Design a protein around this ligand. Structure first.
Ligand code: MG
Ligand code: MG
Ligand code: MG
Ligand code: MG
Ligand code: MG
Ligand code: MG
Ligand code: MG
Ligand code: MG
Ligand code: MG
Ligand code: MG
Ligand code: MG
Ligand code: MG
Ligand code: MG
Ligand code: MG
Ligand code: MG
Ligand code: MG
Ligand code: MG
Ligand code: MG
Ligand code: MG
Lengths: 110, 117, 142, 56, 150, 47, 103
RNA sequence: GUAACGGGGCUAAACCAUGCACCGAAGCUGCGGCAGCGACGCUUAUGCGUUGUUGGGUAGGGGAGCGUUCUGUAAGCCUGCGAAGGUGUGCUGUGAGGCAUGCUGGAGGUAUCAGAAGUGCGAAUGCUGACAUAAGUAACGAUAAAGCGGGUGAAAAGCCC
RNA sequence: CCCGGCGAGGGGAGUGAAAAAGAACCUGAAACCGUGUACGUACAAGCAGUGGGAGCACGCUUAGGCGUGUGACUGCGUACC
């Protein structure tokens, strides 16, 4: 029971998500919710909603058992960059790459 | 008649990028840099096949000189002893018996001194 | 078939003893350098160093004489604006006699780490006595 | 203040080694109920060291 | 090419390229260095070379017995089943079928079929004899072709 | 049998394609020399 | 237990039961080759030659293998002269069972 | 900064004279294979079995090929029991390349022998698009100024009162 | 139907030959950016290679330093146009 749960088109740079994501890899789901609550990033509340959804998908679809559950694999990838025009001085134009992210959390007991 | 192209462009690049597997950084991924390193690898691959015969022929002398000074004779007198004694040409690799068997090399040095005597 | 390459696992090593009291400077270090590499053995390759451990007894008593007693250089630079320094041979024997043979063999030792790996096996000991009786070293001349 | 060459992914990654965060590990409990909170901080309900603070 | 000869930007005082015209194929849309026009590929083909080629081809067919001649080859009614059954009786599939008079009844038949064709004295090009498996060439048509080639 | 024979030996020459590859020997400037009025198309000299 | 011989220029150190690479000959797969030329024979003690190729020395060994050597990329390339070429090479070889090495 | 033997270091490990060794290149000789140009012998829609000799190479000349697109052959052939394309592996030619096959793909591709070129990219301060880098670094736009309570809301320094 | 803010987005169920065709949609390469495993690496110096090459992890043949991946160390070696 792998029960992969992901999010697509998240509003983040993708680098700042890895600072949160690398700490939670290997830890328990009970401890993981406690870390993300008091750790302060905008991506922390985003990954919390994906992590709680990942546990919720294991409860309803699969046979649940949230008392003992670890996170085996976790990773984030770069998304479709929204392109805009930022006004810079002396008639120069900056491309201003607004990046998006693909948060993915594979949570499983085995 | 237009040639749509495409098929041969990447197929030629896969020849270099396959042979470029192992190189550090952009040399194994980026083609423009890989195309340099594979040609440069071919230059050294060509040159080192000449230097293989140099390296080993020099490196074979080390252990022959090593075993010679154990028995109490110089390298110059050792090879000269085999040459002057009834023709008897012999390679430097075939004295590798000296490393495995110590008493086998002793007979080569014994009659080498008899040549100069 | 290919040639027999030596291995770091199977090595001779052990210990030797060499006395520098009645031996000339440089000529001894030359003979110590070749034995430290293992050129007289089945070393047979640069990348595998099978060479035996070697020591010195009475490094301060090494014979040099001539004009080299006063006029020898030992030039070394620190890195700084005016860090160039010079120390004659008699001053090097006066304080820390081990540097005489060390820099004399370090020049004979090749290139970088594997040459310094030979320098790790060297033990000068400028004092009178020592204790390798743990290892039981063998005495030899030349 | 202009780079003459392009830095590598290695040089990028070795710079980002020290940007990694630390774990919390100061999560404590109240003497009355459970209530997981940071050390020297008030809970969601308002319980601090057993004493009720901020009843709103 | 549809477009103008405006300079995209100034000649000097910038890191951008020279930019002479957008219509050049080095740039984006608008290009074609060496434009090809519609042209006549009809070669000369000499009269003695053309006749000499036909005399060679007809000599090769009679050597390999691909040509089979018959007296008074003609279909009664303009129908495909009549000719298809007739060629099935003769044990033939691909045939040129040249005739001197050029009868109208045989012209309508075999127009549907790709393998079986029909032609007159002025037809019978050099490619068709090499392409098709067999050829009729009736004894009426043999006297016309022999006099034509001489 | 429409395509069976080959052309005569030496009749159909390949010819200089040119401007393709270092190994060919006709690459780089392509039989026109280094710089000069011989190179740079449009130049040349009258009869 | 070992001996040495000359086959096609390239001599080798060979013992009984060991397979070694040699140069291609025109002798068949089923046919056996006989080396009269030896520089040393060893059984219990070492026995070298006095003069070139002693009479008593002999090695009977059949030649059974099918294959060619690994391909090597020969690249001749000079910097900034506008020149390059690539070449391959196979080098035919044969193997030997070594039933000989007899006194 | 040793900085006028390459460095260590040497009273021969220097220099001069004599002689015998050894080292030392892609030279030469040995062994095998390929290619161009002359001869001798089996023999001539000429290839082998030999012999002699050549084979660094830009500008540049001459000769011989591979592959890509399209037409003829081809209403043939292969193919939903799996094409083209993509990604691996093995094998093969002196090389450009070819053959087989796993996986992905799910509908066309095309032997042989010729013909026709928009026929092969690594560059031109090339061009278009995408994606890096510097870097999560500068900056976050008049130094007139915010603070606190109570609402709504998932969440309130910025909204409302 | 479940998480979530009666969202965004995703997981099941279901449609369909295919959901690995989900509307940012046939085929989905490379540059580019991560996760996982194997190996190397914090006393070591320079176009980051090649030649030699121990050891370790995956496969052999029943041993025969054999294949694949990594390359401690080491001879030589200053990109391309
Ligand atoms: Mg403006
Ligand atoms: Mg050589
Ligand atoms: Mg520029
Ligand atoms: Mg146009
Ligand atoms: Mg006319
Ligand atoms: Mg030029
Ligand atoms: Mg000129
Ligand atoms: Mg030559
Ligand atoms: Mg040549
Ligand atoms: Mg096509
Ligand atoms: Mg070019
Ligand atoms: Mg561009
Ligand atoms: Mg910041
Ligand atoms: Mg800075
Ligand atoms: Mg700032
Ligand atoms: Mg502002
Ligand atoms: Mg798609
Ligand atoms: Mg280290
Ligand atoms: Mg080196």
């Amino acid at each position: 029971m792998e029960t992969i749960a992901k999010h697509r088109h998240a509003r983040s740079s993708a680098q700042k998500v890895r600072l949160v994501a690398d700490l939670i890899r290997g830890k328990k789901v009970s401890q993981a919710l406690d870390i993300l609550t008091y750790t302060n990033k905008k991506a922390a509340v985003l990954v919390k909603k994906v992590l709680e959804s990942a546990i919720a998908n294991a409860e309803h679809n699969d046979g649940a058992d949230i008392d003992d559950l670890k996170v085996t694999k976790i990773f984030v990838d770069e998304g479709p960059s929204m392109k805009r025009i930022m006004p810079r001085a002396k008639g120069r134009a900056d491309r201003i790459l607004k990046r998006t992210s693909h948060i993915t959390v594979v949570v499983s007991d085995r | 008649a237009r040639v749509k192209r495409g098929v041969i462009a990447r197929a030629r690049h896969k020849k270099i990028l396959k042979q470029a597997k192992g190189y550090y950084g952009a040399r194994s991924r980026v083609y423009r840099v890989a195309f340099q390193a594979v040609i440069k690898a071919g230059q050294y691959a060509y040159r080192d096949r000449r230097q293989r015969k140099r390296q080993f022929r020099q490196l074979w002398i080390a252990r022959i000189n090593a075993a010679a000074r154990q028995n109490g004779i110089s390298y110059s007198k050792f090879i000269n002893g085999l040459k002057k004694a009834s023709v008897e040409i012999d390679r430097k690799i075939l004295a590798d018996i000296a490393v495995f068997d110590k008493v086998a090399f002793t007979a080569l040095v014994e009659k080498a001194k008899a040549a100069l005597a | 078939m290919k040639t027999f390459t030596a291995k770091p696992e199977t090595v001779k090593r052990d210990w030797y003893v060499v006395d520098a009291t009645g031996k000339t400077l440089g000529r001894l270090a030359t003979e110590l350098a070749r034995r430290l590499r293992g050129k007289h053995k089945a070393e047979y390759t640069p990348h595998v160093d099978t060479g035996d451990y070697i020591i010195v007894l009475n490094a301060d008593k090494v014979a040099v004489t001539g004009n080299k007693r006063t006029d020898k250089v030992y030039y070394h630079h620190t890195g700084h604006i005016g860090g160039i320094k010079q120390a004659t041979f008699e001053e090097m024997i006066a304080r820390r006699p081990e540097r005489v043979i060390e820099i004399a063999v370090k020049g004979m030792l090749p290139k970088g780490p594997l040459g310094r790996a030979m320098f790790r096996k060297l033990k000068v000991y400028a004092g009178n006595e020592h204790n390798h009786a743990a290892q039981q070293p063998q005495v030899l001349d030349i | 203040a202009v780079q003459q060459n392009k830095p590598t992914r290695s040089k990028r990654g070795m710079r980002r080694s020290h940007d990694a965060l630390t774990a919390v590990t100061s999560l404590s409990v109240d003497k009355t109920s459970g209530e997981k909170h940071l050390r020297h901080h008030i809970t969601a309900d308002g319980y601090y060291r057993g004493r009720k603070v901020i009843a709103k | 090419v549809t477009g103008s000869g405006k300079k995209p930007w100034r000649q000097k005082g910038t890191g951008r390229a020279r930019s002479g015209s957008i219509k050049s194929p080095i740039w984006r849309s608008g290009g074609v260095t060496f434009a090809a026009r519609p042209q006549d590929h009809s070669q000369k083909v000499n009269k003695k070379m053309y006749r000499g080629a036909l005399k060679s081809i007809l000599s090769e067919l009679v050597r390999q017995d691909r040509l089979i001649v018959v007296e008074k080859f003609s279909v009664e009614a303009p129908k495909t089943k009549l000719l298809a059954q007739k060629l099935k009786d003769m044990a033939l599939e691909d045939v040129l079928i040249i005739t001197g008079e050029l009868d109208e009844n045989l012209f309508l038949a075999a127009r549907n079929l790709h393998k079986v064709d029909v032609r007159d004295a002025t037809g019978i090009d050099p490619v068709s004899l090499i392409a098709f498996d067999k050829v009729v060439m009736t004894a009426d048509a043999v006297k016309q072709v022999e006099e034509m080639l001489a | 049998r429409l395509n069976t024979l080959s052309p005569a030996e030496g009749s159909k020459k390949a010819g200089k394609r040119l401007g393709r590859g270092i190994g060919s020997g006709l690459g780089k400037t392509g039989g026109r020399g280094h710089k000069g009025q011989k190179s740079r198309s449009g130049g040349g000299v009258r009869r | 237990m070992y001996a040495v011989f000359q086959s096609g220029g390239k001599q080798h150190r060979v013992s009984e039961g060991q397979t070694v690479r040699l140069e291609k000959l025109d002798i068949a797969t089923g046919e056996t080759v006989e080396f009269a030329e030896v520089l040393m024979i060893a059984n219990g003690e070492e026995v070298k030659i006095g003069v070139p190729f002693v009479d008593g020395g002999v090695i009977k060994a059949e030649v059974v293998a099918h294959g060619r050597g690994e391909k090597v990329k020969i690249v001749k390339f000079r910097r900034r002269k506008h020149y390059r070429k690539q070449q391959g090479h196979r080098q035919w070889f044969t193997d030997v069972k070594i039933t000989g090495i007899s006194a």
